[PDB]
Write an enzyme that holds these catalytic residues in place. Structure first.
Site, PDB file in Angstrom:
ATOM      1  N   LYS A  65       0.848  -1.415   0.004  1.00  0.00           N
ATOM      2  CA  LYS A  65       0.042   0.046  -0.017  1.00  0.00           C
ATOM      3  C   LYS A  65       0.965   1.309  -0.042  1.00  0.00           C
ATOM      4  O   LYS A  65       1.597   1.520   0.784  1.00  0.00           O
ATOM      5  CB  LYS A  65      -0.878   0.122   1.115  1.00  0.00           C
ATOM      6  CG  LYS A  65      -2.015   1.129   1.210  1.00  0.00           C
ATOM      7  CD  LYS A  65      -3.049   0.726   0.202  1.00  0.00           C
ATOM      8  CE  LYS A  65      -3.996  -0.145   0.767  1.00  0.00           C
ATOM      9  NZ  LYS A  65      -5.108  -0.670  -0.151  1.00  0.00           N
ATOM     10  N   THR A 104      -2.930  -5.558   0.367  1.00  0.00           N
ATOM     11  CA  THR A 104      -2.665  -4.046   0.408  1.00  0.00           C
ATOM     12  C   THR A 104      -3.393  -3.459   1.549  1.00  0.00           C
ATOM     13  O   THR A 104      -2.912  -2.704   2.384  1.00  0.00           O
ATOM     14  CB  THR A 104      -2.473  -3.496  -0.874  1.00  0.00           C
ATOM     15  OG1 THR A 104      -3.724  -3.296  -1.327  1.00  0.00           O
ATOM     16  CG2 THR A 104      -1.763  -4.112  -1.828  1.00  0.00           C
ATOM     17  N   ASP A 105      -4.700  -3.813   1.695  1.00  0.00           N
ATOM     18  CA  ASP A 105      -5.448  -3.444   2.840  1.00  0.00           C
ATOM     19  C   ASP A 105      -5.019  -3.687   3.994  1.00  0.00           C
ATOM     20  O   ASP A 105      -5.335  -2.984   4.865  1.00  0.00           O
ATOM     21  CB  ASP A 105      -6.933  -3.693   2.243  1.00  0.00           C
ATOM     22  CG  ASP A 105      -7.974  -3.024   3.080  1.00  0.00           C
ATOM     23  OD1 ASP A 105      -8.228  -1.943   3.028  1.00  0.00           O
ATOM     24  OD2 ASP A 105      -8.577  -3.839   4.310  1.00  0.00           O
ATOM     25  N   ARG A 110      27.063  35.352 -10.739  1.00  0.00           N
ATOM     26  CA  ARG A 110      25.763  34.852 -11.448  1.00  0.00           C
ATOM     27  C   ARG A 110      24.799  34.441 -10.147  1.00  0.00           C
ATOM     28  O   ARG A 110      25.514  34.214  -9.008  1.00  0.00           O
ATOM     29  CB  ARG A 110      25.866  33.516 -12.284  1.00  0.00           C
ATOM     30  CG  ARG A 110      26.500  32.403 -11.572  1.00  0.00           C
ATOM     31  CD  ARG A 110      26.515  31.488 -12.686  1.00  0.00           C
ATOM     32  NE  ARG A 110      26.774  30.125 -12.074  1.00  0.00           N
ATOM     33  CZ  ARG A 110      26.810  28.791 -12.734  1.00  0.00           C
ATOM     34  NH1 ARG A 110      26.350  28.979 -14.027  1.00  0.00           N
ATOM     35  NH2 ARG A 110      27.188  27.687 -12.020  1.00  0.00           N
ATOM     36  N   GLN A 138      28.763  21.592  -9.678  1.00  0.00           N
ATOM     37  CA  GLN A 138      29.439  20.315  -9.274  1.00  0.00           C
ATOM     38  C   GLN A 138      30.370  20.436  -7.925  1.00  0.00           C
ATOM     39  O   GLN A 138      30.283  19.468  -7.014  1.00  0.00           O
ATOM     40  CB  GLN A 138      30.243  19.834 -10.452  1.00  0.00           C
ATOM     41  CG  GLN A 138      29.450  19.366 -11.416  1.00  0.00           C
ATOM     42  CD  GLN A 138      29.107  20.459 -12.898  1.00  0.00           C
ATOM     43  OE1 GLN A 138      28.929  21.731 -12.390  1.00  0.00           O
ATOM     44  NE2 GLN A 138      29.176  20.226 -13.978  1.00  0.00           N
ATOM     45  N   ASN A 170      19.794  23.180 -11.669  1.00  0.00           N
ATOM     46  CA  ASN A 170      20.421  24.583 -11.633  1.00  0.00           C
ATOM     47  C   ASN A 170      19.249  25.390 -12.245  1.00  0.00           C
ATOM     48  O   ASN A 170      19.226  25.507 -13.415  1.00  0.00           O
ATOM     49  CB  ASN A 170      21.524  24.665 -12.548  1.00  0.00           C
ATOM     50  CG  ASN A 170      22.593  25.950 -12.347  1.00  0.00           C
ATOM     51  OD1 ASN A 170      22.076  26.715 -11.834  1.00  0.00           O
ATOM     52  ND2 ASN A 170      23.746  25.748 -12.713  1.00  0.00           N
ATOM     53  N   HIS A 220      17.635  28.171 -13.487  1.00  0.00           N
ATOM     54  CA  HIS A 220      18.269  29.717 -14.115  1.00  0.00           C
ATOM     55  C   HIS A 220      17.576  30.876 -13.938  1.00  0.00           C
ATOM     56  O   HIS A 220      16.271  30.913 -13.850  1.00  0.00           O
ATOM     57  CB  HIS A 220      18.198  29.114 -15.612  1.00  0.00           C
ATOM     58  CG  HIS A 220      19.260  28.403 -15.930  1.00  0.00           C
ATOM     59  ND1 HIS A 220      19.146  27.191 -16.738  1.00  0.00           N
ATOM     60  CD2 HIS A 220      20.513  28.257 -15.731  1.00  0.00           C
ATOM     61  CE1 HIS A 220      20.033  26.418 -16.793  1.00  0.00           C
ATOM     62  NE2 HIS A 220      21.029  27.047 -16.327  1.00  0.00           N
TER      63      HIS A 220
END
Ligand SMILES: O=c1[nH]c(=O)c2[nH]c(=O)[nH]c2[nH]1
Ligand SMILES: O=c1[nH]c(=O)c2[nH]c(=O)[nH]c2[nH]1
Ligand SMILES: O=c1[nH]c(=O)c2[nH]c(=O)[nH]c2[nH]1
Ligand SMILES: O=c1[nH]c(=O)c2[nH]c(=O)[nH]c2[nH]1
Lengths: 287, 287, 287, 287
Positions: free
Chosen positions: C12, C57-58, C170, C213, C239, C241
């Site tokens: 689940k 799953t229940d 930058r 990096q 990154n 921009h």
């Protein structure tokens, strides 16, 4: 100093309902996202917390599912039943807003009970009841279209902040969002939806565009000229920019072939096309 | 039979602007998502594709960035400069709507030029000009709050479709989305926003809730009573259900500790709290 | 001709749990998004539809809520309990992957039972069990950061497709997405998470970046050097921009103050920083 | 005690490309979202900020558009061109990962240059180059399917936390997300994609499901048995719950007609169906 309770409404939003019709082996699917909100005298609820008038949102949800059991011809017919039930079932409820999104499914290879979602568009419907009056607005959204040519844009004023170059050949891409108001609840809702959808698509494709504003006008005109039951249609069309990439630096040219599809910002052109004489500000376009 | 162009507006939507103030080593950051749309005489543009009156959405975009160069004290002030520029710079432009979302940033350990995004809320502002009339609506959204107790819901009517059990202790969780209209431009925009935020949070947390409606009313009442510059505040509050899980089938009790947080559906309570006597339906609310 | 069932797991996903601690008046909140998946012998379930080995799953969902009742100190502790329960309770279940997102809440003005969501980051934990061995990977995501200066990018090679201009100033903006693997389960999970978060932020803000990096390497190095219990850390940094807008067409310069925050495309820098000698490709990273 | 740089990769992600073919009046549209990442010797870039080996992400972006100018037969072949370019054009670049999402468009009433988007599914392709080896994984995602009947789930163990009841009639809805690895690059990519899509939909619809696991197995088996060029297919299928609403408290039955389509949680069933004897741990799956 003195405070007053103004417009207000409450209910259950986004009730996901799937109704399967299987009286026969040929199953049918209706898939909706329903929202229900009531309007009326809820003064004490807000000012003192007296819930005597507050029909629980959970109850509103239960009612949606209970009514679905009987089935419904169209999404609009279903909303009509809901609004009728709440306005008439409670004396302090004088109206409300009930809306829904309808999702389409296609059979898998014409299979009797296996389908796949058609996510290319979403149909919408909104019903508003105000005392003895009611109005329905249908619409479509999420329908992305694009013209690779047959679009121009020139003749615009050039001020101190203008750098856009005029052009007689550009891509015109947008997401069709339209909503139209019916002047009567006696409509073949499904047939009109399909017609309007086709008219909008046709006008967009076949109109040699001198501007998005122009294309939108022609799309709205086709609808008004074709359906007497529609008093007006509102459209909100983004201009999804596809920039012709500069390839000169790489020793190449770009003859309207390579584009960069930008996310934001985008142009946003909106307008209401209406039948001469019809009211310009129906309450359903608010709250 | 006659088709006519109704209300309409157009411009550039979601212009993402980041303005850095660095005249000193202590850098400041202003982050906005700006939308600009104009209103006026655009009849020929729609019916004939004559763009003489069409200030390109690209131009509107360039203007936003050019104006940001001079800096601005607040988001509202920035929008006010844009509105006055377009309405006054073009005779056929009689008004418009300029909006923005403001995103917050916090310094990283008080660093001079390094920040982290505070995503817990988004501030909004909208300026609308119609001829000589100007109106500003500020707001907040995306602020999720929750009370683990101090919330009740009982005394509501019970009909055929009611199964909800009354309670005197439940979780009350919502996303605070509020917008308030100023009655003057002479406002300390940043100071009022911080104050309104604190008042909505305070009222949500300290009010023993008998219903979300009552909590919403108290939140609004607090704002109106504190700020003379505000004529009304609207709120759209979802009731995000946190279901108390039944563990009795397993022989375990659940003293209001274990909950399932459902996505949809959800209650949606909305209301307007107004200063007595103020305008009932300002056009800025309809867009 | 010969088809074989390979790797497989099921369970689940996204079970939303909110555990309130209210032993005293000072309520505590733990908010998780839990996913449980089992591994083992599910051959017949896939090839024949024999569900004898299929813990529903229940059921897995119910188990999550049932275990939450007893409380838990950390998210990792909760996941360890689930993993132990499923692997030891069913003979054909030999392992699994249990994961969770942990959402943070802050008290509203130090209120005892009223909170607001801190959406500025999301904590993650993943537990994988295989036979008699288990591994835990903790992480953080959604933490957006930005440096207004202190970032350069120059000295890169140039080919015919290179148009980028070198720069010594930058904006450097990213979303911190990091995951680290513990070399032992005996860890002060909450303390290491807070420390790692701090180390990543410090390295980001304080490293004079010559490349994304390089910044990433420093961030990872700080973590490995500080926590002996961590063998490796994987990071994925986009990154984001922020283009310095060209204002010269409007007669203005732009001294690194006005930027356009583009959505896509974005640089994507990824790396694994490891402790010399540690394992090279632990199975938990693959899934 | 020392720190080491492990696996790493970097490039430009989500480069949106629209390639219009307009040799004749019959325009064609190719719409992709491209991601390019390189692998090789980038040690110095990370540990010392030395960018001599760093082919700018901006340059990678430029290459995508430059290459698009020449046109491409299929998405996979476009990726192959990019991968070979970078790996062969730079000695320190030993490989990489290039991926793309392909968006579908349909003509509007067979129009020569007007189209609408088919959002019902998205096609994917991933290419990884390692030395002389070129590995490609094609796939599909976002294809939602639903069977209104022909699905059962019973015979599962009932442990102490099991409350789910057995059923021989339920809705089975999932989002088809599948990816298959080709064992050769000599493939009719468009034809195999169309065939695979058809086979998955066919197996999903015609298999009387005794479990999602069984349905998934049959879907994969059909692909492997039909396409010799495919070594394995991985699927991740959510079990999107459509709960049969209990209308008994309202005095009504519900013969498998009214459902509540829940958002979360959802079952998540995943598995790899391989050709016997094939590689079971290909690096391309790690990403
Ligand atoms: O059709 C258009 N209308 C505009 O208002 C506009 N503005 C712009 O930049 N391009 C366009 N295109
Ligand atoms: O505060 C509430 N108001 C309602 O209108 C409602 N309806 C509901 O089910 N729970 C609640 N709670
Ligand atoms: O097809 C299913 N597989 C399961 O593993 C499961 N678990 C569950 O609750 N329903 C289902 N259905
Ligand atoms: O730090 C960076 N690394 C890159 O690989 C790159 N590519 C690019 O265009 N800008 C940057 N910046």
């Amino acid at each position: 100093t003195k405070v007053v309770l103004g417009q207000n409404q409450y209910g259950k939003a986004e009730v996901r309902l799937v109704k399967v019709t299987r009286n026969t082996a040929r199953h049918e699917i209706q898939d909706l996202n329903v929202t229900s909100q009531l309007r009326g005298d809820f003064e004490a609820a807000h000012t003192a917390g007296d819930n005597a008038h507050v029909v629980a949102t959970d109850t509103q949800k239960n009612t949606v599912y209970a009514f679905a059991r009987d089935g419904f011809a169209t999404t609009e017919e279903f909303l009509l039943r809901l609004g009728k039930h709440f306005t008439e079932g409670f004396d302090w409820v004088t109206g409300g807003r009930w809306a829904a999104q309808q999702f389409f499914w296609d059979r898998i290879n014409d299979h009797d009970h296996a389908f796949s979602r058609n996510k290319s568009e979403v149909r919408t419907a909104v019903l508003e009841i105000s005392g003895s009056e009611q109005a329905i607005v249908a619409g479509i959204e999420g329908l992305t279209v694009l013209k690779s040519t047959g679009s121009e844009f020139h003749g615009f004023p050039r001020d101190k902040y203008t750098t856009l170059q005029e052009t007689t050949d550009r891509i015109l891409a947008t997401d069709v969002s339209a909503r139209w108001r019916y002047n009567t609840v006696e409509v073949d809702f499904d047939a009109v939806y399909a017609s309007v959808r086709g008219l909008l698509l046709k006008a967009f494709a076949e109109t040699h565009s001198l501007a998005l504003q122009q294309t939108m006008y022609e799309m709205g005109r086709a609808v008004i000229e074709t359906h007497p039951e529609i008093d007006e249609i509102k459209m909100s069309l983004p201009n999804k920019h596809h920039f012709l990439v500069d390839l000169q630096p790489f020793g190449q040219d770009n003859p309207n072939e390579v584009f960069y599809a930008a996310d934001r910002p985008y142009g946003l052109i909106e307008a209401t096309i209406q039948r001469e004489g019809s009211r310009a500000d129906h309450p359903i376009w608010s709250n």
